[PDB]
Tab-separated table of C-alpha atoms and ligand atoms in Angstrom:
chain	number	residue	atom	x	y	z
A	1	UNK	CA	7.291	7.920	68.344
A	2	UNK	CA	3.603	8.324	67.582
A	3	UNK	CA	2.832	10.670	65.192
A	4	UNK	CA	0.206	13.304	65.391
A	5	UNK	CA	-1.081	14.174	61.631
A	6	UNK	CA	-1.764	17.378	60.711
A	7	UNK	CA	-4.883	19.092	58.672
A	8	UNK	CA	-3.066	18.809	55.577
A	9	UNK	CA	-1.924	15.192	56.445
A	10	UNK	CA	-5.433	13.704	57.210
A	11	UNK	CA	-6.535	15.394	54.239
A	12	UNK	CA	-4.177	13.099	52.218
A	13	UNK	CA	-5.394	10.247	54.288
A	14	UNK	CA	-9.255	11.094	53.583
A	15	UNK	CA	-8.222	10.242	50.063
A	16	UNK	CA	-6.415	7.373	50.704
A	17	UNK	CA	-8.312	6.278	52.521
A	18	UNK	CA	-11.378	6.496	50.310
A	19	UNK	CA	-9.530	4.674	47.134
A	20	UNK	CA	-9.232	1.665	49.357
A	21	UNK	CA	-12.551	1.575	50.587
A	22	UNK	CA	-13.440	2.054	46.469
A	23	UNK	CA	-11.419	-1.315	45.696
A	24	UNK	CA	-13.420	-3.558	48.218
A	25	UNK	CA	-16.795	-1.580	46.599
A	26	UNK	CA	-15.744	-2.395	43.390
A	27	UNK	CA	-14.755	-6.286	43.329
A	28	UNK	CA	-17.876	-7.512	45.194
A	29	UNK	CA	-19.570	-8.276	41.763
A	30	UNK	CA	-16.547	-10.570	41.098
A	31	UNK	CA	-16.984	-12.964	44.757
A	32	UNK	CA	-18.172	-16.016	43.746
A	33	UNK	CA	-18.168	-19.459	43.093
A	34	UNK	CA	-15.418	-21.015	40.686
A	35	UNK	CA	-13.185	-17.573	40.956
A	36	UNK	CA	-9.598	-18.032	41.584
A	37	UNK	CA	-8.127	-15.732	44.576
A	38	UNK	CA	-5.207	-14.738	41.910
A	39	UNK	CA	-8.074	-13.349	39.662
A	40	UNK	CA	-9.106	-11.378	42.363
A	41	UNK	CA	-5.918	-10.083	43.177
A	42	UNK	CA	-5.630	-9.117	39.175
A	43	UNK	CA	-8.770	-6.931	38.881
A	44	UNK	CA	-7.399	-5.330	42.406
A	45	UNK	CA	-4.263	-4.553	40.969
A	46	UNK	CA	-5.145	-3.470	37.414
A	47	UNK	CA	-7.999	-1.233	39.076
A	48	UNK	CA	-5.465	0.507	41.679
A	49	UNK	CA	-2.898	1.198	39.215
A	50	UNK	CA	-4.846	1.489	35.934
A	51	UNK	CA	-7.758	3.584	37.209
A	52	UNK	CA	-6.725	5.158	40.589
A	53	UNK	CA	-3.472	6.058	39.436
A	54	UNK	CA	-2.619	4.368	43.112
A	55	UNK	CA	-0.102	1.840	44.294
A	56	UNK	CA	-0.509	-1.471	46.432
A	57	UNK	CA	1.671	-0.837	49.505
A	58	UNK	CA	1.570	-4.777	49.879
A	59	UNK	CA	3.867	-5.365	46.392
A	60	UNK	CA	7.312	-5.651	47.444
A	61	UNK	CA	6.079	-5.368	51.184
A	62	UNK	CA	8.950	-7.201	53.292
A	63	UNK	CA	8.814	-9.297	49.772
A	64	UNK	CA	5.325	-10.030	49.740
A	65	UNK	CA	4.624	-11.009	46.151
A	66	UNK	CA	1.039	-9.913	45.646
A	67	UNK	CA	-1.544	-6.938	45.892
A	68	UNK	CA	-4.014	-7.879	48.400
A	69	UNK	CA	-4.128	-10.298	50.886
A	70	UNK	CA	-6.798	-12.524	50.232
A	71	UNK	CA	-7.707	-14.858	53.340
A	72	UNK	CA	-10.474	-17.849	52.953
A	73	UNK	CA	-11.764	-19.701	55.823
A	74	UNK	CA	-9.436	-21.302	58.537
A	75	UNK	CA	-6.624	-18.325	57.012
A	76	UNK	CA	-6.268	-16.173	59.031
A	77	UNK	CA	-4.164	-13.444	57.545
A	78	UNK	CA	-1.843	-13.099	54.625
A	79	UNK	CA	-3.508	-15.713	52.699
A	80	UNK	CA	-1.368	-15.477	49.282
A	81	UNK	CA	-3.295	-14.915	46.081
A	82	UNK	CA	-2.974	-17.973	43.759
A	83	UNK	CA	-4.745	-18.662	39.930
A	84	UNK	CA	-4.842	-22.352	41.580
A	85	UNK	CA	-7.146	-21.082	44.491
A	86	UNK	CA	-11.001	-21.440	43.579
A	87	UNK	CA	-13.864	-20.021	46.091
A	88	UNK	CA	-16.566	-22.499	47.014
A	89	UNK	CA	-20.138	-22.237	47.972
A	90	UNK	CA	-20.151	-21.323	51.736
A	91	UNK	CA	-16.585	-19.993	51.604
A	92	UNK	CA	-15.968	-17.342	53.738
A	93	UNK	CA	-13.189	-14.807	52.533
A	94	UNK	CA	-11.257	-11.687	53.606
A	95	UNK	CA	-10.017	-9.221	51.338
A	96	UNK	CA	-7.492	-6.949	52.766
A	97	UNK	CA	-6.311	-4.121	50.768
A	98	UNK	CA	-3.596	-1.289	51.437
A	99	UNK	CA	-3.246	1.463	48.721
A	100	UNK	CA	-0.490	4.535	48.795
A	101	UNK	CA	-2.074	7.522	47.666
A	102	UNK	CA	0.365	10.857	47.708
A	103	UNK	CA	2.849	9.033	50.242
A	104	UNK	CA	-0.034	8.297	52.010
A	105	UNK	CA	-1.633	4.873	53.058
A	106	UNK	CA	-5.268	3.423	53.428
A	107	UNK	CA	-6.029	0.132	54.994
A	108	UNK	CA	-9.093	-1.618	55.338
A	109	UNK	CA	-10.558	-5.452	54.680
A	110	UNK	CA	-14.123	-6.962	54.815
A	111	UNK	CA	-15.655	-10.539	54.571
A	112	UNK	CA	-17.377	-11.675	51.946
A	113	UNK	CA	-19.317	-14.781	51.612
A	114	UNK	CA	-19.474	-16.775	48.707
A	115	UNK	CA	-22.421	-18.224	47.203
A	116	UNK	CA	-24.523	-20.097	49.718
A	117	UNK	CA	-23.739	-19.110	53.120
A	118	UNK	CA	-23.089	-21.589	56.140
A	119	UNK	CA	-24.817	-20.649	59.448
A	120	UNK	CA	-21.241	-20.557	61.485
A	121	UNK	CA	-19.842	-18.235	58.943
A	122	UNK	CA	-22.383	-15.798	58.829
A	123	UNK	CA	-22.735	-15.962	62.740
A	124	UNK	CA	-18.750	-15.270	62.384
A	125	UNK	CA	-18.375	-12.219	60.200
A	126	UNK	CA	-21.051	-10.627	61.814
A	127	UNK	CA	-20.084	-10.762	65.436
A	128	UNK	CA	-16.029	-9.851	64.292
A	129	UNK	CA	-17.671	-6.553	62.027
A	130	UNK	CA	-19.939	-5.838	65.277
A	131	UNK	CA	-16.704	-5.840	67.696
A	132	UNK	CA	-15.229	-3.316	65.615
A	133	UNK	CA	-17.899	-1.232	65.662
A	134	UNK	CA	-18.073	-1.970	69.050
A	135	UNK	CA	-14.576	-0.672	69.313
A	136	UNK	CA	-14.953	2.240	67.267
A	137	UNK	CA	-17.785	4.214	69.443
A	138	UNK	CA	-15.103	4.337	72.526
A	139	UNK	CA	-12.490	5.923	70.615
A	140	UNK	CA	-12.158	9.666	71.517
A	141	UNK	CA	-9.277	11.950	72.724
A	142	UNK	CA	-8.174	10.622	76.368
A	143	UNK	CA	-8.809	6.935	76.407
A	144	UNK	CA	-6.740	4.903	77.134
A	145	UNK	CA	-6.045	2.035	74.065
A	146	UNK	CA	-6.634	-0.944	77.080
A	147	UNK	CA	-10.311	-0.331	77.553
A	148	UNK	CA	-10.544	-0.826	73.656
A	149	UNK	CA	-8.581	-4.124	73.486
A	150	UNK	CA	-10.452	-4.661	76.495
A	151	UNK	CA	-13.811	-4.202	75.101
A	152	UNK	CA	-13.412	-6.120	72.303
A	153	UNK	CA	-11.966	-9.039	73.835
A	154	UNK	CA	-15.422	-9.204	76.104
A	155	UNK	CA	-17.854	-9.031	73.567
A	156	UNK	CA	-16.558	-11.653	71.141
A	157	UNK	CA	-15.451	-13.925	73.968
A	158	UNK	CA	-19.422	-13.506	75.689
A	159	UNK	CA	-20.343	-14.587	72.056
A	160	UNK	CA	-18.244	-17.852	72.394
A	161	UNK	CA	-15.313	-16.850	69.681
A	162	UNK	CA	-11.889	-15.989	70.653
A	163	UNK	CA	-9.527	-13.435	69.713
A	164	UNK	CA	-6.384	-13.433	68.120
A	165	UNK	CA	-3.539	-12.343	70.352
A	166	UNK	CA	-0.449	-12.220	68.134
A	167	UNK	CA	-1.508	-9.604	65.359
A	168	UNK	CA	-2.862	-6.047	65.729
A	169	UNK	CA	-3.869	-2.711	64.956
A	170	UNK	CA	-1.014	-0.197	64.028
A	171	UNK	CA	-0.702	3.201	63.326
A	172	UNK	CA	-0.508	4.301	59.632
A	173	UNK	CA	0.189	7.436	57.476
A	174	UNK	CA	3.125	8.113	55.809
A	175	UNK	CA	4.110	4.536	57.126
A	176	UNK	CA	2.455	1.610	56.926
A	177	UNK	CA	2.785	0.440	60.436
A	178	UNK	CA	3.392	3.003	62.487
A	179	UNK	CA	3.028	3.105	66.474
A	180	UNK	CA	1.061	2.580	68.378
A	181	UNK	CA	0.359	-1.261	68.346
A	182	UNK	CA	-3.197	-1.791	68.657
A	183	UNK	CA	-4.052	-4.775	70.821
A	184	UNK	CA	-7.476	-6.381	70.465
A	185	UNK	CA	-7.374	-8.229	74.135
A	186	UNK	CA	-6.629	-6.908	77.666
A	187	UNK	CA	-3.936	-6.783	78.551
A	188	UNK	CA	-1.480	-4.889	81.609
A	189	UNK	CA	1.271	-3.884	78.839
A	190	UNK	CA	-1.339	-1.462	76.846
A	191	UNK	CA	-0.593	2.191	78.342
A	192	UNK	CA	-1.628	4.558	75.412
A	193	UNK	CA	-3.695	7.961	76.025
A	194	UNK	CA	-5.571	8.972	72.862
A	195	UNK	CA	-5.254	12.351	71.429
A	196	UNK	CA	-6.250	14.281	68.326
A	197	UNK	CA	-4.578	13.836	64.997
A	198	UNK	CA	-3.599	10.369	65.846
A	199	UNK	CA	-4.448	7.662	62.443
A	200	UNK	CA	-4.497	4.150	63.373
A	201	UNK	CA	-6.555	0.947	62.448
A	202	UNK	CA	-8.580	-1.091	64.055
A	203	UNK	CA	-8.488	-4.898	62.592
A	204	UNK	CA	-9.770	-7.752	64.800
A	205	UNK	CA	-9.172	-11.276	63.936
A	206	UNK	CA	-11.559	-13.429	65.568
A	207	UNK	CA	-11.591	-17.056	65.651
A	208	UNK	CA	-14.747	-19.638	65.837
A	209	UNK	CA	-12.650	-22.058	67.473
A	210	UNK	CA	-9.732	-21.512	69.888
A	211	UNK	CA	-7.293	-18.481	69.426
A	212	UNK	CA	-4.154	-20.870	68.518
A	213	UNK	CA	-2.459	-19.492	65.057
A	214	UNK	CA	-0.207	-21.463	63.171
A	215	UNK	CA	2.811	-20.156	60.357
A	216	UNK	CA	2.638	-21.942	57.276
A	217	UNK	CA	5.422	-23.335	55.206
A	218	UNK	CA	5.554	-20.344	52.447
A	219	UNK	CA	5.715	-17.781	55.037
A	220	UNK	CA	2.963	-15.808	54.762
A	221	UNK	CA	-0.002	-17.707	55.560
A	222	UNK	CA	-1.802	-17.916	58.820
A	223	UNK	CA	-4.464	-20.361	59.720
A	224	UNK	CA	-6.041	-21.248	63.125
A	225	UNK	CA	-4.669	-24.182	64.730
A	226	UNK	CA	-7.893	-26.023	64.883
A	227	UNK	CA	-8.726	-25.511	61.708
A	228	UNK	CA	-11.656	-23.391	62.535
A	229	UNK	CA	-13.072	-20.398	60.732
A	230	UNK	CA	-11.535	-17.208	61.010
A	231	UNK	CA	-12.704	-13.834	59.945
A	232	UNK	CA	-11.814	-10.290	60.364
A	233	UNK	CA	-12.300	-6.362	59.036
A	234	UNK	CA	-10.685	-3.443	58.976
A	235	UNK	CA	-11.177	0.200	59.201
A	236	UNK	CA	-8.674	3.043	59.243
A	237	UNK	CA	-9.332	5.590	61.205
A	238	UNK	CA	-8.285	9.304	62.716
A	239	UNK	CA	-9.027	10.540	66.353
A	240	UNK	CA	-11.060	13.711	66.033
A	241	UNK	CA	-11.796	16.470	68.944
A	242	UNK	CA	-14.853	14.697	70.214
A	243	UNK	CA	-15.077	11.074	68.732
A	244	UNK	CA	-13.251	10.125	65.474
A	245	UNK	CA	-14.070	9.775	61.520
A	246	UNK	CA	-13.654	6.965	59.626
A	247	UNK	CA	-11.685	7.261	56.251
A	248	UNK	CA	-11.950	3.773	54.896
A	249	UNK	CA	-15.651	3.421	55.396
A	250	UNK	CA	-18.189	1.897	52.475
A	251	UNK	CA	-21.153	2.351	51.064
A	252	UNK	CA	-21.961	-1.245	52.807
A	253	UNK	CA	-20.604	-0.112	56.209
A	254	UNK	CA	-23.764	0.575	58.971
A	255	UNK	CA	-22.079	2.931	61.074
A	256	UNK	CA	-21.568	6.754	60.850
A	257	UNK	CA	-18.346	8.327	59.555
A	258	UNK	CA	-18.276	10.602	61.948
A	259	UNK	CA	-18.863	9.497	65.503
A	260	UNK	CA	-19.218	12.307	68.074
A	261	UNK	CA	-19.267	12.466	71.622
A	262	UNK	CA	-21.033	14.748	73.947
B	1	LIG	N1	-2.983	-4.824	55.097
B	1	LIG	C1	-2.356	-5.584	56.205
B	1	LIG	C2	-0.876	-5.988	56.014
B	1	LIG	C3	-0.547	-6.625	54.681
B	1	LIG	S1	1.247	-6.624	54.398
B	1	LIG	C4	1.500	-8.305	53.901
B	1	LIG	F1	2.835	-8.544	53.996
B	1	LIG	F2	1.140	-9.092	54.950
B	1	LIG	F3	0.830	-8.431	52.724
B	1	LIG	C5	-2.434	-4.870	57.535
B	1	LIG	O1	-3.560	-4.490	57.857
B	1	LIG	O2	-1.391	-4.807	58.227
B	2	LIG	CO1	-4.937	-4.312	56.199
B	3	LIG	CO1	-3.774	-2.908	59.046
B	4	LIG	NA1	-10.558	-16.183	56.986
């Protein structure tokens, strides 16, 4: 049941879309040393609901008790917000943010490095935002999702990272994960023919280390098995008649909104 979004829906999603991207603009100025993540996740949620006249899709989410999802270093995903939590020089960290908009959703994350930054985390967030760029110049109407997954899966492997297998993209809109799932590997089971009006994200998690994730305690948190650095990003996005368009992009992103093909 993948649903195909009509002019008035991806109009709804534009603006979504956009307030999420706003959020990530908008807390940069607060990254740094001696924050606490549950800070973070305060300014997010006062500035959704406050100014945007939005609401976190994460509150409530399957019980998840915060905003955002605020991930630093070997976390993978999910990483809890916490007043306890303070960033360090060299810290890498992953904001993920999902706002509701008009029934409708936006998702997108970034990296942001605190203070000081290490060589391996640099070399890390910018090979993971390059494989979704990567990723997001194939998408066009009659791909299949495989060479995507695919794609990505070469380029961050040839780079000596790895790729994490057990969380992916999803389709969003009036849901917040919607089909299709959106693999970021190879893999024989993807069989999905792109078309326009389909919304979906695009969220790699790469690894500096092996791809091994582990479940923590609270369940919520993610972190790689070895214990090395993980990073990822996030863009929504909607396939267009000859390429796609971007909804969640920033003033920071390098790439084009709209990418055509021809
Ligand atoms: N924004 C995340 C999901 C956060 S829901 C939570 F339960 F994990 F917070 C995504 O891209 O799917
Ligand atoms: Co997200
Ligand atoms: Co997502
Ligand atoms: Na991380």
């Amino acid at each position: 049941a993948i649903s195909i979004k009509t002019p008035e829906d991806i109009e709804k999603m534009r603006v979504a879309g956009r307030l999420a991207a706003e959020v990530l603009e908008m807390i940069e100025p607060y990254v740094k040393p001696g924050v606490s993540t549950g800070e973070l996740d305060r300014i997010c949620n006062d500035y959704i609901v406050n100014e945007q006249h939005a609401v976190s899709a994460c509150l409530g989410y399957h019980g998840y008790p915060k905003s955002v999802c605020i991930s630093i270093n070997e976390v993978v995903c999910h990483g809890i917000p916490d007043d306890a939590k303070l960033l360090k020089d060299g810290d890498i960290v992953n904001i993920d943010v999902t706002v509701i908009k008009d029934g409708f959703h936006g998702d997108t994350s970034k990296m942001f490095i605190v203070g000081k930054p290490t060589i391996m985390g640099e070399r890390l967030c910018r090979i993971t935002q390059e494989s979704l760029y990567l990723a997001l110049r194939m998408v066009k109407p009659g791909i299949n999702l495989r060479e995507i997954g695919a794609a990505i899966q070469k380029f961050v492997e040839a780079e000596g990272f790895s790729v994490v297998r057990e969380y992916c993209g999803h389709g969003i809109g009036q849901g917040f994960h919607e089909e299709p799932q959106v693999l970021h590997y190879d893999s024989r089971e993807t069989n999905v023919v792109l078309k326009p009006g389909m919304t979906f994200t695009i969220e790699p998690m790469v690894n500096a280390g092996k791809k091994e994730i582990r479940t923590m305690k609270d369940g919520w948190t993610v972190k790689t098995k070895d214990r090395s650095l993980s990073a990822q990003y996030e863009h929504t996005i909607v396939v267009t008649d000859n390429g796609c368009e971007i909804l969640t992009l920033r003033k920071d992103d390098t790439i084009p909104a709209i990418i055509s093909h021809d």
